[PDB]
Amino acid sequence: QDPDVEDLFSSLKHIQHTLVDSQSQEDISLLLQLVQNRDFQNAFKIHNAVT
Amino acid sequence: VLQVLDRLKMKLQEKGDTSQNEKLSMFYETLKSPLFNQILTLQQSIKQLKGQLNHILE
């Protein structure tokens, strides 16, 4: 578990459990997929480990 | 999409929830970051070469 990935994932889940309108639900679902994607995560971790 | 992040930030403001203002902006800046974009692009290129290899192997 990468604390940065998890912190971001948690923030997104909070949004998903707060905004109930249809567009927000679709938008957040897309962002959760992105954050769940292995390619995104590899770039994300490396980026953070260098800054 | 930066438009999605932007819209979500605004909808949260409207609800009176600013707990994610900073988190979203940081996420936003990372996705727009030159370093991040260079890393993404390069990793996809390496990913494609590895796929070419796997293919070659029968």
Swiss-Prot record, chain A:
Provide the species name.
Answer: Mus musculus
> Which comment does the entry carry about domains?
The L27 domain 1 functions in targeting to the tight junctions by binding to and stabilizing PATJ.
Q: How does it assemble?
A: Heterodimer with MPP1. Forms a heterotrimeric complex composed of PALS1, LIN7B and PATJ; the N-terminal L27 domain of PALS1 interacts with the L27 domain of PATJ and the C-terminal L27 domain of PALS1 interacts with the L27 domain of LIN7B. Component of a complex composed of PALS1, CRB1 and MPP4. Component of a complex whose core is composed of ARHGAP17, AMOT, PALS1, PATJ and PARD3/PAR3. Component of a complex composed of PALS1, CRB1 and EPB41L5. Within the complex, interacts (via HOOK domain) with EPB41L5 (via FERM domain), and interacts with CRB1 (via intracellular domain).
**Into which family does the record put it?**
Belongs to the MAGUK family.
What does gene deletion cause? Conditional knockout in the retina results in mice which are viable, fertile, and morphologically normal apart from microphthalmia with severe defects in visual response. From 13.5 days post-conception (dpc) retinas show variable morphology, including retinal folding, variable thickness and disorganization. Postnatally the retinal lamina is thinner, and disorganized, with a shortening or absence of the inner and outer segments of photoreceptor cells.
Question: Where is it expressed, tissue-wise?
Answer: Expressed in the retinal pigment epithelium (at protein level). Expressed in the vascular plexus of the retina (at protein level). In the brain, expressed in the dentate gyrus of hippocampus, striatum and cerebellum (at protein level). Expressed in the sciatic nerve (at protein level). Expressed in the kidney nephron (at protein level). Expressed in the lung, and heart. Expressed in placenta, brain, skeletal muscles, pancreas and liver.
- Phenotype for residue 31 to G: No effect on PARD6B interaction. Prevents interaction with PATJ
Its annotated function is as follows: Plays a role in tight junction biogenesis and in the establishment of cell polarity in epithelial cells. Also involved in adherens junction biogenesis by ensuring correct localization of the exocyst complex protein EXOC4/SEC8 which allows trafficking of adherens junction structural component CDH1 to the cell surface. Plays a role through its interaction with CDH5 in vascular lumen formation and endothelial membrane polarity. Required during embryonic and postnatal retinal development.
Q: What is the name of this protein?
A: Protein PALS1
Q: Where in the cell is it found?
A: Golgi apparatus; Cell membrane; Endomembrane system; Cell junction, Tight junction
Q: Note the residue range shown relative to the complete protein.
A: 123 to 170 of 675
Where's the L27 domain?
4-51
From Swiss-Prot, chain B:
Residue span, L27 domain: 1-54
Q: In which tissues is it expressed?
A: Expressed in renal tubules (at protein level). Expressed in bladder, testis, ovary, small intestine, colon, heart, skeletal muscle, pancreas and cerebellum in the brain.
- Record's function text: Scaffolding protein that facilitates the localization of proteins to the cell membrane. Required for the correct formation of tight junctions and epithelial apico-basal polarity. Acts (via its L27 domain) as an apical connector and elongation factor for multistranded TJP1/ZO1 condensates that form a tight junction belt, thereby required for the formation of the tight junction-mediated cell barrier. Positively regulates epithelial cell microtubule elongation and cell migration, possibly via facilitating localization of PRKCI/aPKC and PAR3D/PAR3 at the leading edge of migrating cells.
Q: Which domain of life is it from?
A: Eukaryota
Recorded protein name is InaD-like protein
Protein localization? Cell junction, Tight junction; Apical cell membrane; Cytoplasm, Perinuclear region
- Domain statement: The L27 domain (also called Maguk recruitment domain) is required for interaction with PALS1 and CRB3, and PALS1 localization to tight junctions. The PDZ domain 6 mediates interaction with the C-terminus of TJP3 and is crucial for localization to the tight junctions. The PDZ domain 8 interacts with CLDN1 but is not required for proper localization.
SUBUNIT field: Forms a ternary complex with PALS1, CRB1 and CRB3. Component of a complex whose core is composed of ARHGAP17, AMOT, PALS1, INADL/PATJ and PARD3/PAR3. Forms a heterotrimeric complex composed of MMP5, LIN7B and PATJ; the N-terminal L27 domain of PALS1 interacts with the L27 domain of PATJ and the C-terminal L27 domain of PALS1 interacts with the L27 domain of LIN7B. Component of a complex composed of CRB3, PALS1 and PATJ. Interacts (via N-terminus) with PALS1/PALS (via PDZ domain).
* Species this chain originates from: Homo sapiens (Human)
Q: What is the lineage of its organism?
A: Eukaryota, Metazoa, Chordata, Craniata, Vertebrata
